[PDB]
Coordinates of all heavy atoms in Angstrom, one line a residue:
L1 N 0.9 -1.2 0.0 CA 0.0 0.0 0.0 C 0.9 1.2 0.0 O 0.6 2.3 -0.7 CB -1.0 0.0 1.2 CG -1.9 1.2 1.4 CD1 -2.6 1.5 0.1 CD2 -2.8 1.1 2.6
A2 N 1.9 1.2 0.8 CA 2.9 2.3 0.9 C 3.6 2.4 -0.4 O 3.9 3.5 -0.9 CB 3.8 2.1 2.1
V3 N 4.0 1.3 -0.9 CA 4.8 1.2 -2.2 C 3.9 1.7 -3.4 O 4.4 2.3 -4.3 CB 5.4 -0.2 -2.4 CG1 5.1 -0.7 -3.8 CG2 6.9 -0.2 -2.1
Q4 N 2.6 1.4 -3.2 CA 1.6 1.7 -4.3 C 1.2 3.2 -4.0 O 0.5 3.8 -4.9 CB 0.5 0.8 -4.3 CG -0.6 1.2 -5.3 CD -1.4 0.0 -5.8 OE1 -1.0 -0.7 -6.7 NE2 -2.5 -0.2 -5.2
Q5 N 1.5 3.7 -2.8 CA 1.1 5.1 -2.5 C 2.0 6.1 -3.1 O 1.7 6.8 -4.0 CB 1.0 5.2 -1.0 CG -0.4 5.0 -0.4 CD -0.8 6.1 0.6 OE1 -1.0 7.2 0.3 NE2 -0.9 5.6 1.9
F6 N 3.2 6.1 -2.6 CA 4.2 7.0 -3.1 C 5.4 6.3 -3.7 O 6.1 6.8 -4.5 CB 4.7 7.8 -1.8 CG 5.0 7.0 -0.6 CD1 6.2 6.3 -0.4 CD2 4.1 6.9 0.4 CE1 6.4 5.5 0.7 CE2 4.3 6.1 1.6 CZ 5.4 5.4 1.7
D7 N 5.6 5.1 -3.2 CA 6.7 4.3 -3.8 C 8.0 4.8 -3.2 O 8.6 5.7 -3.8 CB 6.7 4.3 -5.3 CG 5.4 4.2 -5.9 OD1 4.5 5.1 -5.9 OD2 5.1 3.2 -6.7
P8 N 8.5 4.1 -2.1 CA 9.7 4.5 -1.5 C 10.9 4.0 -2.3 O 11.0 2.8 -2.5 CB 9.6 3.9 -0.1 CG 8.5 2.9 -0.1 CD 7.7 3.0 -1.4
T9 N 11.8 4.9 -2.6 CA 12.9 4.5 -3.4 C 13.8 3.5 -2.6 O 13.3 3.0 -1.6 CB 13.7 5.8 -3.7 OG1 14.2 6.2 -2.5 CG2 12.8 6.9 -4.2
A10 N 15.0 3.2 -3.1 CA 15.9 2.3 -2.5 C 16.3 2.8 -1.1 O 16.3 2.1 -0.2 CB 17.1 2.0 -3.4
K11 N 16.6 4.1 -1.1 CA 17.1 4.7 0.1 C 16.0 4.5 1.2 O 16.3 3.9 2.3 CB 17.4 6.2 -0.1 CG 18.9 6.4 0.1 CD 19.8 6.2 -1.1 CE 21.2 6.2 -0.9 NZ 22.0 6.8 -1.9
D12 N 14.8 4.9 0.9 CA 13.7 4.8 1.8 C 13.6 3.3 2.2 O 13.5 3.0 3.4 CB 12.4 5.2 1.1 CG 12.3 6.7 0.8 OD1 13.0 7.4 1.4 OD2 11.5 7.0 -0.1
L13 N 13.6 2.5 1.2 CA 13.5 1.0 1.5 C 14.5 0.6 2.6 O 14.2 -0.2 3.4 CB 13.5 0.2 0.2 CG 12.3 0.2 -0.6 CD1 12.4 -0.9 -1.7 CD2 11.0 -0.1 0.3
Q14 N 15.7 1.2 2.4 CA 16.8 0.9 3.3 C 16.4 1.1 4.7 O 16.5 0.2 5.6 CB 18.1 1.8 2.9 CG 19.2 0.8 2.6 CD 19.5 -0.2 3.7 OE1 18.9 -1.2 3.8 NE2 20.4 0.2 4.6
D15 N 15.9 2.3 5.0 CA 15.5 2.7 6.3 C 14.2 1.8 6.7 O 14.2 1.2 7.8 CB 15.1 4.2 6.4 CG 14.6 4.6 7.8 OD1 15.3 4.2 8.8 OD2 13.7 5.4 7.9
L16 N 13.3 1.9 5.8 CA 12.0 1.1 6.0 C 12.4 -0.3 6.5 O 11.7 -0.9 7.3 CB 11.2 1.1 4.8 CG 9.9 0.3 4.8 CD1 9.1 0.5 6.1 CD2 9.1 0.5 3.5
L17 N 13.5 -0.8 6.0 CA 14.0 -2.1 6.4 C 14.4 -2.1 7.8 O 14.0 -3.0 8.6 CB 15.1 -2.6 5.4 CG 15.6 -4.0 5.6 CD1 14.5 -5.0 5.2 CD2 16.9 -4.3 4.9
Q18 N 15.2 -1.2 8.2 CA 15.7 -1.1 9.6 C 14.8 -0.2 10.4 O 15.1 0.4 11.4 CB 17.1 -0.5 9.6 CG 18.1 -1.5 10.3 CD 17.9 -1.5 11.8 OE1 16.9 -1.9 12.3 NE2 18.9 -1.0 12.5
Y19 N 13.5 -0.1 9.9 CA 12.5 0.7 10.6 C 11.4 -0.2 11.1 O 11.1 -0.1 12.3 CB 12.0 1.6 9.6 CG 10.9 2.6 10.0 CD1 11.2 3.7 10.8 CD2 9.5 2.3 9.8 CE1 10.1 4.6 11.3 CE2 8.5 3.2 10.3 CZ 8.9 4.3 11.0 OH 7.9 5.1 11.5
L20 N 10.8 -1.0 10.2 CA 9.7 -1.9 10.6 C 10.3 -3.3 10.8 O 10.2 -3.8 11.9 CB 8.6 -1.8 9.5 CG 7.5 -0.8 9.8 CD1 6.6 -0.8 8.6 CD2 6.8 -1.2 11.0
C21 N 10.9 -3.8 9.8 CA 11.5 -5.2 9.9 C 12.5 -5.1 11.0 O 12.8 -4.1 11.6 CB 12.2 -5.6 8.5 SG 10.9 -6.2 7.4
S22 N 13.0 -6.3 11.4 CA 14.0 -6.5 12.4 C 15.4 -6.4 11.9 O 15.6 -6.4 10.7 CB 13.8 -7.8 13.2 OG 12.9 -7.6 14.4
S23 N 16.3 -6.4 12.8 CA 17.8 -6.3 12.4 C 18.1 -7.5 11.6 O 18.4 -7.4 10.4 CB 18.7 -6.2 13.7 OG 20.1 -6.2 13.3
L24 N 18.2 -8.7 12.2 CA 18.5 -9.9 11.5 C 17.7 -10.0 10.2 O 18.3 -10.2 9.2 CB 18.3 -11.1 12.5 CG 18.2 -12.5 11.8 CD1 19.4 -12.8 11.0 CD2 17.9 -13.6 12.8
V25 N 16.4 -9.8 10.3 CA 15.5 -9.9 9.2 C 16.2 -9.0 8.1 O 16.2 -9.4 6.9 CB 14.1 -9.5 9.6 CG1 13.4 -8.7 8.4 CG2 13.3 -10.7 10.0
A26 N 16.6 -7.8 8.5 CA 17.1 -6.9 7.5 C 18.3 -7.5 6.7 O 18.4 -7.4 5.5 CB 17.6 -5.6 8.3
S27 N 19.0 -8.4 7.5 CA 20.1 -9.1 6.8 C 19.6 -10.1 5.9 O 19.9 -10.1 4.7 CB 21.0 -9.7 7.9 OG 22.2 -10.3 7.4
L28 N 18.8 -11.0 6.4 CA 18.2 -12.1 5.6 C 17.6 -11.5 4.3 O 17.9 -12.0 3.3 CB 17.2 -12.9 6.4 CG 17.8 -13.8 7.6 CD1 16.7 -14.4 8.3 CD2 18.7 -14.8 7.0
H29 N 16.9 -10.4 4.5 CA 16.3 -9.7 3.4 C 17.4 -9.1 2.5 O 17.3 -9.3 1.3 CB 15.3 -8.7 3.8 CG 14.5 -8.0 2.8 ND1 15.0 -7.0 1.9 CD2 13.2 -8.2 2.4 CE1 14.1 -6.7 1.0 NE2 12.9 -7.5 1.3
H30 N 18.4 -8.5 3.1 CA 19.4 -8.0 2.3 C 20.0 -9.0 1.4 O 20.5 -8.7 0.3 CB 20.5 -7.3 3.3 CG 20.6 -5.8 3.1 ND1 19.6 -5.0 2.6 CD2 21.7 -4.9 3.4 CE1 20.0 -3.8 2.6 NE2 21.2 -3.7 3.1
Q31 N 20.1 -10.2 1.9 CA 20.6 -11.3 1.2 C 19.7 -11.7 0.0 O 20.1 -12.1 -1.1 CB 20.9 -12.6 2.1 CG 22.3 -13.1 1.8 CD 22.7 -14.0 2.9 OE1 22.3 -15.2 3.0 NE2 23.6 -13.5 3.8
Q32 N 18.4 -11.6 0.3 CA 17.4 -11.9 -0.8 C 17.5 -11.1 -2.0 O 17.7 -11.6 -3.1 CB 16.0 -11.8 -0.2 CG 15.6 -13.0 0.7 CD 14.9 -12.6 2.0 OE1 14.0 -11.8 2.0 NE2 15.4 -13.1 3.1
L33 N 17.6 -9.8 -1.8 CA 17.7 -8.8 -2.8 C 19.0 -9.1 -3.6 O 19.0 -9.3 -4.8 CB 17.6 -7.4 -2.3 CG 16.2 -6.8 -2.2 CD1 16.3 -5.2 -2.2 CD2 15.3 -7.3 -3.3
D34 N 20.1 -9.2 -2.8 CA 21.4 -9.5 -3.4 C 21.2 -10.6 -4.5 O 21.9 -10.5 -5.5 CB 22.4 -10.0 -2.4 CG 23.7 -9.2 -2.2 OD1 24.4 -9.2 -3.2 OD2 23.9 -8.6 -1.1
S35 N 20.3 -11.5 -4.2 CA 20.1 -12.6 -5.1 C 19.2 -12.1 -6.3 O 19.5 -12.3 -7.5 CB 19.4 -13.8 -4.4 OG 20.1 -15.0 -4.7

């Protein structure tokens, strides 16, 4: 909904990651994208 609202760039996503998601999760996720 947020992505469909304004669509947070990569930068925003970065924070959004370390904002809502958890630390570790951020990592796991970080690995996902990397892929």
